[PDB]
C-alpha cells in the first residue's frame, strides 16, 4: 500500500576518510496528498537518536510526494558494525515501516593493488589504456580513483567488484589517455581507499620505466 521505504548507506569514501562526513539516507516514495505527512524515527543499535534533518516533500512527476530523512553517522560507528534503523509512521501505513541497514559482516582483508601498462598491441591506436587491478579485499565496499601529477583524471571507468574464487573481491579500473601523453613518460597514479589499509589509503604509480 505504501509508502515504500528504502534506506541507503554511506559512500565508502566518506566513511574511510576523516575529512568527510558520511550519512545514511532514508528515502520514502509513493505518498499521496490525502496522506502526505511523514514521521521519522531513527535508531542506532536500537537506541533512538535525534539529529536527522528531514527534507521537504518534493512532489514528483507522477502525482506523488517524495520525502527524505538523512542521518549523520560517525566513522568509527559505521565501521564498527552498528545497525541503523529507520521507522516511518504515516496515516496510510497501518504499522510503521522499519528498514534497517548495517555494514557488511566479515573479517576485512587488505587489498593488493597493481598497476598495469598498455599492451604493445594497443600503441597502434590513438589512445592507450591504463589498468589498475585491485584484488583481495573484503567487503565489496571500496573507492578507486585516478590522478595525473595532482589533478583527478576524468577518463576512467571501474568494473563493479567481482567475487573471487577465494572469497575476496576484485575490480579493474581502466584509465584512458592519449598515447602522446604516454610516451613522454608522465606519471599516473591509481588511488585506493578501503577499510583494510593503513590510513585507509594506498597509492600505486604507473609511468614508463
Amino acid at each position: 500500500a505504501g509508502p515504500d521505504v528504502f534506506l541507503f548507506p554511506p559512500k565508502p569514501k566518506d566513511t574511510l576518510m576523516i575529512s568527510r562526513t558520511p550519512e545514511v539516507t532514508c528515502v520514502v516514495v509513493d505518498v499521496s496528498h490525502e496522506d502526505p505527512e511523514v514521521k521519522f524515527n531513527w535508531y542506532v543499535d536500537g537506541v533512538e537518536v535525534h539529529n536527522a534533518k528531514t527534507k521537504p516533500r518534493e512532489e514528483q512527476y507522477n502525482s506523488t510526494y517524495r520525502v527524505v530523512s538523512v542521518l549523520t553517522v560517525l566513522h568509527q560507528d559505521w565501521l564498527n558494525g552498528k545497525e541503523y534503523k529507520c521507522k516511518v509512521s504515516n496515516k496510510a501505513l497501518p504499522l510503521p515501516e522499519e528498514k534497517t541497514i548495517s555494514k557488511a559482516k566479515g573479517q576485512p582483508r587488505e587489498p593488493q593493488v597493481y598497476t598495469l601498462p598498455p599492451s604493445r598491441d594497443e600503441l597502434t591506436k590513438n589512445q592507450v589504456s591504463l589498468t589498475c587491478l585491485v584484488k583481495g579485499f573484503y567487503p565489496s565496499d571500496i573507492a578507486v580513483e585516478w590522478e595525473s601529477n595532482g589533478q583527478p583524471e576524468n577518463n576512467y571507468k571501474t568494473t563493479p567488484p567481482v567475487l573471487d574464487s577465494d572469497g575476496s573481491f576484485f575490480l579493474y579500473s581502466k584509465l584512458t589517455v592519449d598515447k602522446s601523453r604516454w610516451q613522454q613518460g608522465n606519471v599516473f597514479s591509481c588511488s585506493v581507499m578501503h577499510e583494510a589499509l593503513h590510513n585507509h589509503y594506498t597509492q600505486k604509480s604507473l609511468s614508463l620505466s
Partner: protein, 157 residues
C-alpha cells in the same frame, strides 16, 4: 422510453455485472433479437464479448444504447469522451472482478495527473482545455503492474 444502464458505464470488462432498466411513465432486443426477459428490467450475470452491440426496449406503452465488453485488467470508465469547459469529468480505473487495486495512477499524454493509495475515482472538478488528450489508468493487481486500454478525451467550444 429510454433504456437506462446501472452502473451506467457503457464500457465494461468481462465478469462484470450489468443491468438494463427500461423506463416508462416489457419486451427487449439485443442486436435486433428478442431478449428472453419480460420483466421491467433485464440482468447480465457476467459480461462476455457476446453481449456487445445495440440494446433496445419496448414497454407495452427505443433508440439504441451501446455496450462494449472489453477484456483485460483495467478499464477506464467515463460517461462520455467529450465535454465542454467547466464540466465535471469523472474517470474510474475499473479492475477485473472489482479486484483490490493499490497505488493507482491516472495519466494523460503519458503523464501522471493524479495518484492514490487505493482504487479511487478521478475527478477533474471543472474541465479546462489543457485537459483533453490521451488517457489510461494503471495500478497493482496482486503483485502485477497493469494498465488500462487508452481513451481519447476532447473538450470543445
Amino acid at each position: 422510453a429510454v433504456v437506462f444502464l446501472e452502473p451506467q458505464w457503457y464500457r465494461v470488462l468481462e465478469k462484470d455485472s450489468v443491468t438494463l432498466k427500461c423506463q416508462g411513465a416489457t419486451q427487449w432486443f439485443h442486436n435486433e433479437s428478442l431478449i428472453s426477459s419480460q420483466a421491467s428490467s433485464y440482468f447480465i450475470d457476467a459480461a462476455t464479448v457476446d453481449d456487445s452491440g445495440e440494446y433496445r426496449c419496448q414497454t407495452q406503452l427505443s433508440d439504441p444504447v451501446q455496450l462494449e465488453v472489453h477484456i483485460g485488467w483495467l478499464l477506464l470508465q467515463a460517461p462520455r469522451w467529450v465535454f465542454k469547459e467547466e464540466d465535471p469529468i469523472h474517470l474510474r480505473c475499473h479492475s477485473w472482478k472489482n479486484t483490490a487495486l493499490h497505488k493507482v495512477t491516472y495519466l494523460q499524454n503519458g503523464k501522471g495527473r493524479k495518484y492514490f493509495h487505493h482504487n479511487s475515482d478521478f475527478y477533474i472538478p471543472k474541465a479546462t482545455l489543457k485537459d483533453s488528450g490521451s488517457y489510461f489508468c494503471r495500478g497493482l493487481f496482486g503483485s502485477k503492474n497493469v494498465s488500462s486500454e487508452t481513451v481519447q478525451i476532447t473538450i470543445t467550444q
